[PDB]
Amino acid sequence: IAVGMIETRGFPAVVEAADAMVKAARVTLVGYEKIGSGRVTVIVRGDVSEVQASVAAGVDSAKRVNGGEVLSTHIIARPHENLEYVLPIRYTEAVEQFR
Amino acid sequence: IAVGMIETRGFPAVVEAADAMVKAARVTLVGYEKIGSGRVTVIVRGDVSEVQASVAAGVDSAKRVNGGEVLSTHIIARPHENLEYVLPIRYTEAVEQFR
Amino acid sequence: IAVGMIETRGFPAVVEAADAMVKAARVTLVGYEKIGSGRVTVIVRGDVSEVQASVAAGVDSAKRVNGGEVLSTHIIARPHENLEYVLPIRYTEAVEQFR
Amino acid sequence: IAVGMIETRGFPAVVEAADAMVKAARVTLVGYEKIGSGRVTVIVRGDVSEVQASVAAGVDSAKRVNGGEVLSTHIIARPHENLEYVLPIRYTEAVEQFR
Amino acid sequence: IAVGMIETRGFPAVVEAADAMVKAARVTLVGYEKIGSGRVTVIVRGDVSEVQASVAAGVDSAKRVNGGEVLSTHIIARPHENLEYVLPIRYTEAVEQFR
Amino acid sequence: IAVGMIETRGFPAVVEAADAMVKAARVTLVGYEKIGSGRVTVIVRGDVSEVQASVAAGVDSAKRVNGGEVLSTHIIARPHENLEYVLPIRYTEAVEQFR
Amino acid sequence: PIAVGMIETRGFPAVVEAADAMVKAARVTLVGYEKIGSGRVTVIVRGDVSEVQASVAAGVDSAKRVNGGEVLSTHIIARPHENLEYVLPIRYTEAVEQF
Amino acid sequence: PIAVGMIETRGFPAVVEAADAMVKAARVTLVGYEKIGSGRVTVIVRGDVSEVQASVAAGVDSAKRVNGGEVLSTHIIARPHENLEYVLPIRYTEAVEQF
Amino acid sequence: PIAVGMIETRGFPAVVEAADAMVKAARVTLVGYEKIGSGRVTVIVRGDVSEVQASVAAGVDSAKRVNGGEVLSTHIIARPHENLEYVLPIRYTEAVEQF
Amino acid sequence: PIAVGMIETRGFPAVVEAADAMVKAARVTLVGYEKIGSGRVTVIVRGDVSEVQASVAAGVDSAKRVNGGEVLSTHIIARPHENLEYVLPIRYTEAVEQF
Amino acid sequence: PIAVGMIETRGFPAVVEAADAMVKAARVTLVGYEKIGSGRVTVIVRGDVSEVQASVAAGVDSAKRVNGGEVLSTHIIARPHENLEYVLPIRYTEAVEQF
Amino acid sequence: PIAVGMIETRGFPAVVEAADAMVKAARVTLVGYEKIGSGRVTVIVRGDVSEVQASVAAGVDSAKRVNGGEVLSTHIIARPHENLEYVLPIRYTEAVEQF
């Protein structure tokens, strides 16, 4: 299951990115990551094609935000299982209860 | 229920943004978010039209603050339910006890 | 009860701001807030006129600090009750035991 | 057992770095480290030659990321045991359960 | 009892500031404060004249540090009791056990 | 017992600094400190002459790191006991179990 | 009015059955679960007075049928004073709210 | 003077009834709830001496009527020494203050 | 439907045997372990109703064979109400999910 | 010398009365309160040996008068070894220090 | 196969002796220690089945010789299901791994 | 060799006396204090075997003289396996180290 990420500078924009992503295709927002310098990432999981659709929409929508800025984005089609155990890209408890 | 966000650089300004928002219309301040680089966001919930009124007032009032600066703002009319589970835009425990 | 805020860049200056505020008038320092980028805020509560007196003194005294810098300030005469529940402007446990 | 590190500015890029590293050779991603200013490090362990292979791939892949930036990298062939006890380069609980 | 503060950019320098302060006069280092942007403060308590001696020595010694930088300093002769309850300038548990 | 400190900008470099320090002479790495703005410090303890040897090696090795940068360094020959109680320069639990 | 209903059991299995029988028998929300020792645990439900009475009755009959089941005490409070919400686990949690 | 009133029960339901009966019978504030094992739990109220006496009496009569209810001990302290506030859960909390 | 199965024992060793026998005897997942005092502990499993019945039966037979083993109570809930998931440790955890 | 005095009760109300009677009967400071199960709780006071003896005696007489009161054990240590301070809740806390 | 061995005692001293006797009598690793109330505590060891049997036997003989020693229950599981690792303290910890 | 000595009491006051008598009677360090329920608590000391024997003996005689004192179990382990240090509170803490 692919992973999609949009990193913005600013919180409002990251929230819009996430909203646009889950609305554009069949992906689950699994988390959000702060790393400082105003950089925040929203992470979604789903089929590669769903994730591609969601990230493209997420980027477009975030850039429309008043003062919105997208810093980086990336999609990994088949993330190695090891990552699930170290980085915050896994379906969380709260998350799978929403499903 | 819509979500409204004002991100400022500086705490005093974000506090004013929040005060102005809840006073301008029928919205509930549900939280506050720090992301570093002096960037803080206040988040309100309510009817889209209430939120529109509150954000416009929040922006005007924050800009009047001595040294106040607004970095970004955004309103999402119908935030996807998935967001409530990942991002800090949900009515909190403390919050719904105030209601 | 009004809320007064002085945000400085630097800790020594914020400590002086707070000392000057509680000494200048009848206000209670209720808290302190860090938001990154060296930005820290001290928050006091009291009658609007007391708070006005305290913030003016706090600003003057903070600017006298060696390397002191004031970034922003603001006073809200009647902060909405909703804020008390979300933002760190409320009388705390430790605080009301000092009173 | 060698330690390999790639530090990026941006989260998406660090996630790609990690994915590329564990896919390129026989290394275990043991952790991730945030230090502010958007600087994040992913850490892998394995035979020196595996780690060399993984870091080279991790760097190439991270630089291909949209808005990806690599700040620093380093490999230590035989890290002193003392480090395992202070710095986050050790196999963690969650990690060795994945193995 | 007076409070003395030296804020540096850099940790090594703040550690030297503290060492120099407690060695120069009869003051107790009561704490250390991080506020981001590399800004850290060391706080001492003691008689105003002891604190004056310690801060002057602390500044001189910190500036001798390789890459040492002092950002701000301040002394408050009779800090208001209210501050003890909000800001980290109080004798701590660990601290008074050293005494 | 002397204290030695190397502060870098970047995590990989600080890890190398630490490795080089404990390998160059008879010192114990006792901790690591993050203060933001990418500034991290590694702290060692040992005889002044051991610490001098370790810091010199730590600096040389950190500067060889790809993208490595050393911001500041310092050695305190006889750190005042008060510091042990406030600043993170003390032998920790985990640490003395390694010994 | 919105009553609170409580069933206390000796043993966890029996208390889980009480809870399941309570929310199934009537229009009530399980809001809490309280451990106090001696194998005594309480499930707390909220709802209309008549709904809570229906559910507590169902809860008790079912719990007593559990193998090694044992009900210690029960009680229904019709109009719980607001003060209680703030001290005891009878209040709704945002957790059980989202649901 | 401002007395403290305590009812200790065996069982949680009975202690919740004690609390509800206490704050309802007189001008007192429930400030705490204390678990100590063996199924023993205490509700603590604050108020004038005469108010606390009225409420403790109501509390006990009501608690004994709870199904499987059982009161273990009670006590009213008329002028609790200030020292106690700082060690025991008899003090008001900002939680119960806001209310 | 997806039932929940619970075995409560007196003693930890016996409860660990119950759990091991349960997941081995049928298609069930151990999702929780609950301590409530008096030496009473519960293991909770999730699975189809028929699978959970098979496993609880195996669990009980095995637990009673443990040296100093002792089963206090057991229960199977066929269709646990969703409300319970949110209050009690019967829900899957991302921990047991990854597995 | 500075002795430590302890009264252990069965029940919380009685232990709160012990504490109140102790600090009122003599020049002692309540520094701790210890829960260990089976409804056993201890109040610990510090002071001169003769002061602690006066207070423990008062404490016991008063505690035994509490409704459902019960004193389990008491003890006075005249010169408690410094080692104990560091392991047990007999030491002053900055909490009780500020007072 | 890698079995798990458990000795549960009444009393801590006896459980510490059990653990010491177990790891000394055979090739096993103490991985956990479990408190569940009523003075019942368990030590858990991991190792080959034959090694764990040797150690549990040694553990029990030694524990029964402890003054006021008392063994409540014991059990050896030869092939503990992987599910258990994720719910119970039978798994290795990085703590006991480093050793 | 460096033995561990343990005295377990019923009641806290008696356990505090045991500890005080132990460190006073011989060259031992109190390193821990363990609560396990049923009013059972253990004090743990470290030292030479002969020193620990002297202290445990003193500890027991003194504890039995405590009003309402009661010793449940004791034990001395001459050469505690290193594995134990990592699982149980018999290890020195940096807390008791600094002293």
From Swiss-Prot, chains G, H, I, J, K, L:
List the coiled-coil residues. Answer: none
Q: Which Pfam families match?
A: BMC
Biological process (GO) annotations held by this record are: carbon fixation; photosynthesis
Annotated Gene Ontology MF terms?
Answer: identical protein binding; structural constituent of carboxysome shell
One Gene Ontology cellular component term attached to this UniProt record is: carboxysome
* InterPro entries recorded: Bact_microcomp_CS (IPR020808), BMC_dom (IPR000249), BMC_shell (IPR050575), CcmK (IPR046380), CcmK-like_sf (IPR037233), CcmK/CsoS1_BMC (IPR044872)
User: What range(s) does the BMC domain occupy?
Assistant: 3-89
Keywords for the protein's UniProt record, in alphabetical order? Bacterial microcompartment, Carbon dioxide fixation, Carboxysome, Photosynthesis
Localisation: Carboxysome
Location (main, coarse): other
| SUPFAM superfamilies, per the entry | CcmK-like
Q: Which domain of life is it from?
A: Bacteria
What protein family is recorded? Belongs to the bacterial microcompartments protein family. CcmK subfamily.
Q: What is known of its domains?
A: The tight homhexamer forms an irregular pore with an opening about 4.8 X 6.5 Angstroms.
State the function annotated in the UniProt record: Probably the major shell protein of the carboxysome, a polyhedral inclusion where RuBisCO (ribulose bisphosphate carboxylase, rbcL-rbcS) is sequestered. Assembles into hexamers which make sheets that form the facets of the polyhedral carboxysome. The hexamer central pore probably regulates metabolite flux.
**Assembly and interactions?**
Homohexamer. Stacked hexamers, with the concave faces together, have also been crystallized. Interacts preferentially with itself, then with CcmK1 and CcmK4a in vitro. May interact with CcmL, this occurs at very high CcmK2 concentrations. Interacts with CcmN and CcmO in the carboxysome.
- Show the PANTHER family listed in the entry: CARBOXYSOME SHELL PROTEIN CCMK4, PROPANEDIOL UTILIZATION PROTEIN PDUA
Descriptive protein name: Carboxysome shell protein CcmK2
Task: Give the species.
Answer: Thermosynechococcus vestitus (strain NIES-2133 / IAM M-273 / BP-1)
State which gene encodes it. Answer: ccmK2
